[PDB]
Amino acid sequence: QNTVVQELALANKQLLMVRQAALHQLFEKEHRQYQQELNQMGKAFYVERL
């Protein structure tokens, strides 16, 4: 049971990394398409010294 608990910890960390990678990809793609549609509308995001 001790090494099973260690194994649950490792599986938690593995799904943490893969979920973080997918979430980062999704947030980047969402930001890109939001900027695209705002440029279609006539506005844009403000980036520090853009």
């Binding site: 599986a11 960390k13 593995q14």
Partner: protein, 52 residues
């Protein structure tokens, strides 16, 4: 003595600690791939004898 530093803390023998954690995760994922790891290992009996 010293201050007995923990994980993530970059003070001490942390480089070998983080390589050891990479090795532990690395062996755990090898066990994921070859399917002998303990997270299933009943889980074809554990629920297949427990089916209502």
């Amino acid at each position: 003595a010293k201050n007995l530093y923990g994980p993530g803390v970059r003070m001490g023998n942390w480089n070998e600690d983080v390589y050891l954690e990479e090795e532990r995760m690395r062996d755990f994922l090898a066990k994921r791939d070859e399917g002998q790891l303990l997270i299933q290992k009943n889980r074809r009996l554990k629920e297949n004898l427990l089916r209502p």
